[PDB]
Amino acid sequence: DSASFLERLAVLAGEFSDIQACSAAWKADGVCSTVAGSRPENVRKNRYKDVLPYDQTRVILSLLQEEGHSDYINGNFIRGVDGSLAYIATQGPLPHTLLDFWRLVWEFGVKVILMACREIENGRKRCERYWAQEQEPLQTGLFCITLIKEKWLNEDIMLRTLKVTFQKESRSVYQLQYMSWPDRGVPSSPDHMLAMVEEARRLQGSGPEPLCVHCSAGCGRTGVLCTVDYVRQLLLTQMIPPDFSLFDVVLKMRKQRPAAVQTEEQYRFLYHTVAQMFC
């Protein structure tokens, strides 16, 4: 029933402006810093100078620490509906952070990656390819990535089944890639993104390992995906309260990953998606 929310639903423009105002006030007065990402040795590991992970929630890598690898990746944990670390929101890896991306995926036991960008968008590099191609395994440091299968779920979503081998162990990792997110604006409808989230959840199954979600910066589109999944988990567990607030969910996300849900158009798209889920 609380899905009441629809009965309650320029309003959205004002609401997004309030999210921006509140999150900016929190950056200024709250426990919020970017010390690690600004260290000289880490600056080159950031795709964008204005996107640094907050120290408070940053992903601290330990895999291969004994072999001298740094703890740093541009990525943050985001809490899920049970208060556990349910998402890792990170950037699209650079040539020199590919190895770190796989350390992240391996260390935290990630089963599903959601990628919400293309390698190149409108003539600009946005993400390095970290997956293998047909009959062309990819060696990245000590990781060997093999392509087992590729499947288009619909015209906008690719599913890759990967075999990832490290230190004599092989794991299955599924990667879902959204293939048509526009350079300006948002998708024509929420349907195919919802299909992506639905499939990710089937592949994830039970168990606490985080979903790995990324776009190019790891902010806007990434925050849309994490929020849609968070709200869908509330819905499926019958835990939408009568005072459910999408505003509060997005604001909370913004305190964990910088600029989670970056634009008014993204916020409106998220509203459209949630309304559709609520029927």
Residue numbers in the entry: 6 to 8, 10 to 15, 24 to 293
Text of the article:
Protein tyrosine phosphatases (PTPs) play a critical role in regulating cellular functions by selectively dephosphorylating their substrates. The ∼280 residue PTP catalytic domain consists of an α/β structure, and biochemical and structural studies have led to a detailed understanding of the catalytic mechanism (Barford et al., 1994; Zhang, 2002). Key features of the domain include the PTP signature motif, the mobile Trp-Pro-Asp “WPD” loop that in the closed conformation positions the conserved and catalytically important aspartate residue, and the phosphotyrosine recognition loop. Here we report the crystal structures of 22 PTP domains, including two tandem-domain RPTP structures and a detailed structural comparison of this protein family.
In the first category are TCPTP, SHP1, SHP2, BDP1, LYP, PEST, PTPBAS, DEP1, MEG2, and GLEPP1, which have a “PTP1B-like” accessible pocket that harbors a basic residue corresponding to Arg24 of PTP1B. This pocket has the potential to accommodate pY at the +1 position as in PTP1B or potentially other acidic or phosphorylated residues in positions N-terminal to the substrate pY. The new structural data and analysis presented here suggest that a secondary substrate-binding pocket, similar to that found in PTP1B, is present also in SHP2, BDP1, LYP, SHP1, TCPTP, MEG2, PTPBAS, DEP1, and GLEPP1. PTPs with particularly high enzymatic activity against generic substrates were RPTPσ and PTP subgroups R5, R3, NT1, NT2, NT3, NT4, and NT5. In contrast, RPTPσ, the R7 group, and NT4 group PTPs were quite selective and showed a preference for a sequence derived from the phosphorylation site in N-cadherin (pY785), a reported substrate of RPTPσ (Siu et al., 2007).
